[PDB]
């Protein structure tokens, strides 16, 4: 039984991607200081405890599920699509999410506000004519006052309905103050939608929509994610744990319940 570790995660044979200052979700959405991870791949994503967010304050209803799905997909390969947002201003940004000197936003998201004095009922559609699954990431803005709601989206109450033939999600935005995060009581909530082959994404909204810019290519492989602070090293080791890479020669182990690769069983 293996009860000791080297203290270091070996960079072979598996492709290890060090997240450094970024969680996988921040990389997915396109937090400016995670832009280097655009279009990256991994057999194992390593989330460090030093990770932080530095964009618009946000949460994810059902965080752990989305995180797991993306981690298992093992890629952030984005494909921009031509979404036609008729009658609304695009590319909304913030000082809470700087990219370079100027104000910016999540790179994979498109913050739609009013155009002139009107916010029309948006209704776009986007079929999946490919043979693989598309992952769309979108959200809803929750203003902290009514003043903000009517300044940004005109209508006193917003609504976001993203749907496919199988499933549907309608969100009504909650107008009210949250705890102050980097000078902002307002929030964005993130939702996701999978669109299978032959199926059609339909987004419809009269306010508060944080629109998607395209999709992410989904795969099913050996990819996964792990929380660890152990540094990376130029060695070979089949088994990886959070406490470090371990020899798998012995039939069992009790270094950690969480493992990746061809490993001994936990006791």
């Amino acid at each position, epitope marked *: 039984v293996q009860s000791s570790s080297t203290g270091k995660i070996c960079n072979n044979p598996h492709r290890i991607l060090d997240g450094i200052d970024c969680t996988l979700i921040d990389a997915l959405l396109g937090d400016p200081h995670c832009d280097v991870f655009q279009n990256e791949t991994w057999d194992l994503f390593v989330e460090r405890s030093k990770a932080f967010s530095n964009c*618009y304050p946000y949460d994810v209803p059902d965080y752990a599920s989305l995180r797991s799905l993306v981690a298992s997909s093992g890629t952030l390969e984005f494909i921009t699509e031509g979404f036609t947002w008729t009658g609304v*201003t695009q*590319n*909304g*940004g*913030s*000082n*809470a999410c700087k990219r370079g000197p*100027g*104000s*910016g936003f999540f790179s994979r998201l498109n*913050w739609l*506000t*009013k155009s*002139g*004095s009107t916010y029309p009922v948006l209704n776009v559609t986007m079929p999946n004519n490919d043979n693989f699954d598309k992952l769309y990431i979108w959200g809803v803005h929750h*203003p*902290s*006052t009514n*003043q*903000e709601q*009517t*300044s*940004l989206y005109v209508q006193a109450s917003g609504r976001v309905t993203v749907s496919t033939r199988r499933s549907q999600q309608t969100i009504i935005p909650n107008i009210g103050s949250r705890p102050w995060v980097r*000078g*902002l*009581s*307002s929030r964005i909530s993130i939702y996701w939608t999978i669109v299978k082959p032959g199926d059609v994404l339909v987004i419809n909204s009269n306010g508060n929509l944080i629109a998607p810019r395209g999709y992410f290519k989904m795969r099913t492989g050996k990819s996964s994610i792990m929380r660890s602070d152990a540094p990376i090293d130029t060695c070979i080791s089949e088994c990886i744990t959070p406490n470090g890479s371990i020899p798998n020669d012995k039939p069992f182990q009790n270094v950690n319940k969480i493992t990746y690769g061809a490993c001994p069983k936990y006791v």
Partner: antibody, heavy 137, light 108 residues
Framework: VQLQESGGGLVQPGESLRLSCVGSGSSFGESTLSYYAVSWVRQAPGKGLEWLSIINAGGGDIDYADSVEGRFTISRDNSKETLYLQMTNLRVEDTGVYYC??????????????????????????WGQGTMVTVSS | DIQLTQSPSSLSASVGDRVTLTCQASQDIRKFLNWYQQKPGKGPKLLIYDASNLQRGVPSRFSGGGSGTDFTLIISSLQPEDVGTYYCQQYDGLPFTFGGGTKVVIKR
């Protein structure tokens, strides 16, 4: 929104003079002047309108005309709903009435933390009454 | 820098006449163009924004048209109050400029 200017007066050629412009009230929603981009515009006696300087809602994306570049500095204090035009090294031909003029398209919502990435700088939908600046000896 | 040339420089028409002011442009400015009514001893007020759009509050008798380089501001029925100078203004590119002016006078 309504606007009003102040700070105008008599000055000697070469002197400095600050002009202020206070915004008051509410437009669509309850949006104050701090939601908008504003520019300074002057009119010499018996002449046309000359655009001077623009500033985006949040204080960035500033540009000038060649006639006043290097000498004039545009700036704003949104906590006070006020715009400023500092003028230095003034000359006789800078004489005229100075207007504050708001661009209509909303550029920010401060309480929300939104900013439009493109500076539209479109139609001057609100003007002040104007303030008289005179440069002489 | 984009120059705007208005025509005429000065005009006279009777109460209820159809009046045509024009603004011509140094280059293609698409429809990034506005019009303004400066009354005498008072500040400018927006009439037309973005080539053709009438401002809320401004009488229906005023209208706007054009694109590219040529643009028109029509008064369908000139009134006593409609005296004063009219300016066209562009914002296609910096620096922003105004027209020379068109002074309108009532003929009685």
């Amino acid at each position: 929104v309504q606007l009003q200017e102040s700070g105008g007066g008599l000055v000697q050629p070469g002197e400095s003079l600050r002009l202020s412009c206070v915004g008051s009230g509410s437009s669509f929603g309850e949006s104050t002047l701090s939601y908008y981009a504003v520019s300074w515009v002057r009119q010499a006696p018996g002449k046309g309108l000359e655009w001077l300087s623009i500033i985006n809602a949040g204080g960035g994306d500033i540009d000038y005309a060649d006639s006043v570049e290097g000498r004039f500095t545009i700036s704003r204090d949104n906590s006070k709903e006020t715009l400023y035009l500092q003028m230095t090294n003034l000359r006789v031909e800078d004489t005229g009435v100075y207007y504050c003029a708001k661009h209509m398209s909303m550029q920010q919502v401060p309480s929300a933390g939104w900013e439009r990435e493109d500076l539209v700088g479109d139609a001057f939908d609100v003007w002040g009454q104007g303030t008289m600046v005179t440069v002489s000896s | 820098d984009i120059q705007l040339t208005q025509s005429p420089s000065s005009l006279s028409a009777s109460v209820g006449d159809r009046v045509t002011l024009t603004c011509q442009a140094s280059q293609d400015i698409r429809k990034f163009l506005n019009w303004y009514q400066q009354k005498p001893g008072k500040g400018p007020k927006l009439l037309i924004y973005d080539a053709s759009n009438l401002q809320r509050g401004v009488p229906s008798r005023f209208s706007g048209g054009g694109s590219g380089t040529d643009f028109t501001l029509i008064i369908s029925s000139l009134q006593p109050e409609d005296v004063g100078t009219y300016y066209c203004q562009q914002y296609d590119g910096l620096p922003f400029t105004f027209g020379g002016g068109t002074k309108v006078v009532i003929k009685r």
